[PDB]
Amino acid sequence: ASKLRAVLEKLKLSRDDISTAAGMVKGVVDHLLLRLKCDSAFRGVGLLNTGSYYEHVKISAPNEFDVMFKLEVPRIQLEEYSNTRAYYFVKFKRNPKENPLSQFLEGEILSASKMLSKFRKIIKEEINDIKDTDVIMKRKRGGSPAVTLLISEKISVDITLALESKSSWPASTQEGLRIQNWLSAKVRKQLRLKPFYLVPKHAKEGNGFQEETWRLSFSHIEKEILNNHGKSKTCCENKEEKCCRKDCLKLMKYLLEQLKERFKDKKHLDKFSSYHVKTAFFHVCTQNPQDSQWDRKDLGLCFDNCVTYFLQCLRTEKLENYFIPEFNLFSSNLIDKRSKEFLTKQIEYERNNEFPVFD
């Protein structure tokens, strides 16, 4: 109640930190975007600002920014890899015109691993010829489609290549985005007329990866929803309509960040990410579609609703991707049962003890 408000106060981003970080990031990102347009493959590349900073749910410090370098790929033909619902091979239809991505084809399949290698290579060469600014590239991770930069040893920038398709969303999405009773059927229809994205994250094949696979991304839609999040079009535009939706997501993010920090050397929580609590939070929005169910005065209850839904997800080992219902973020394949039981026990103790990990 009063204690949660004091936590939200401490999580607020400093105006001075925002001013310095926003300037540093824009300078680096604008430069790379310019250099990439100069390569034959990446002529159409455009910027999408995404994740928690641009959703206004970043907590503590503005020290991690996300951007998509998107690229329209006309006449795309997707093939689902192995019923995984989220991972696809990219092929092309008949096209008289030369394909600008020819260099990355393996037979008829656009190689995610080749395209990412060149993307990463270009960015690497380019961040040397930045001289005015201190910028290094961190080592490639199999988990992330992103190239990660560190600016002035303090600010991380994740850049993901993203193919843009203006086609209908794949069939795996048909029962996703259950926003009809919250944001309206007409908004669901408008969002589903927007493009979708594919990022070069590869699917599991036995011991390793199917290195040519891409994964669906709806980061653009997640941002649209968080920054236009009410049943009322004037939600949070006036003092009579201040909801606690973003406050509840910030508190869930802080709960996980604090537990991950406390066990950062003991492995049990390494497989959990902020995307787990972001996804769970969108599900609680579907369950609680009225702005009256997110009144600022009910912060403690609204936060409890998010905590108990997340606990139910851990116990049942079910957390659907918000866009792709048959994609289980909490499957055995991804997170072993012992890790989920360990997180459940820490979160139960926090809920039973008024969240001492916040104090």
Ligand X SMILES: Cc1oncc1/C(O)=C(\C#N)C(=O)Nc1ncc(S(C)(=O)=O)c(-c2cccc(F)c2)n1
Ligand Y SMILES: Nc1ncnc2c1ncn2[C@@H]1O[C@H](COP(=O)(O)OP(=O)(O)OP(=O)(O)O)[C@@H](O)[C@H]1O
Cα angle 69, 71, 77; round to 5: 135
For residue 1, CA distances in Å to 5, 60, 263, 302, 354 come to 7, 20, 27, 10, 10
Least distance from C-beta 159 to ligand X, angstroms? 6
- Within residues 253-292, the interface with ligand X by CB under 6 A covers 273
- Within residues 194-213, the interface with ligand X by CB under 6 A covers 199, 201
Query: Residue 274 has which token pair?
Result: 């902020």
Cα–Cα distance, 327 to 226 (Å, whole number): 22
50 contact choice in Zn ion, Mg ion, ligand X, none (CB below 5 to 8 Å, kind-dependent): ligand X
User: Which residue in 84, 65, 55, 68 sits closest to 26, CA to CA?
Assistant: 65
Closer residue to ligand X in complex, CB, 219/279: 219
3 state SS of 292: helix
52 contact choice in Mg ion, ligand X, Zn ion, none (CB below 5 to 8 Å, kind-dependent): Mg ion
Among 58, 202, 246, 250, binds ligand Y (CB under 6 A): 58
**For Mg ion, what does the binding mask look like between residues 134 and 173, x meaning CB under 5 A?**
------------------------x---------------
What is the CB neighbour count within 10 angstroms for residue 228? 12
Cα–Cα distance, 210 to 206 (Å, whole number): 9
Closer residue to ligand Y in complex, CB, 99/148: 148
If binding is defined by CB under 6 A, does position 51 make contact with ligand Y? Answer: yes
- Within residues 27-66, the interface with ligand X by CB under 6 A covers 50-51, 66
If binding is defined by CB under 5 A, does position 248 make contact with Zn ion? Answer: no
Query: Residue 337 has which token pair?
Result: 């049962």
Cα–Cα distance, 299 to 305 (Å, whole number): 10
Contact yes or no for 218/50 (Cβ under 8 A):
no
- Binding range to Zn ion, per CB under 5 A, among 57-65, 118-126, 168-176, 243-251: 243-251
Least distance from C-beta 6 to ligand X, angstroms? 27
If binding is defined by CB under 6 A, does position 144 make contact with ligand X? Answer: yes
Q: By beta-carbon distance, which residue lies closest to ligand X? A: 143
Cα–Cα distance, 142 to 66 (Å, whole number): 17
Annotated binding site for 2',3'-cGAMP: 66, 158, 201, 215
- Within residues 202-241, the interface with Zn ion by CB under 5 A covers 230, 235-236
The conformation of residue 157, written as its DSSP 8-state character, comes to E
**For Mg ion, what does the binding mask look like between residues 50 and 69, x meaning CB under 5 A?**
-xx-----------x-x---
Closer residue to ligand X in complex, CB, 99/273: 273
Beta bridge pairs of residue 276: none
Among 111, 165, 213, 219, binds ligand Y (CB under 6 A): 219
Cα–Cα distance, 331 to 11 (Å, whole number): 31
The bridge status of strand 64-72 relative to strand 155-165 is parallel
For residue 105, CA distances in Å to 113, 114, 212, 246 come to 11, 9, 10, 43
The footprint of ligand Y (CB under 6 A) covers 50-52, 58, 64, 66, 158, 217, 219, 222, 273-275, 278
State the residues that interact with Mg ion by CB under 5 A. Answer: 51-52, 64, 66, 158
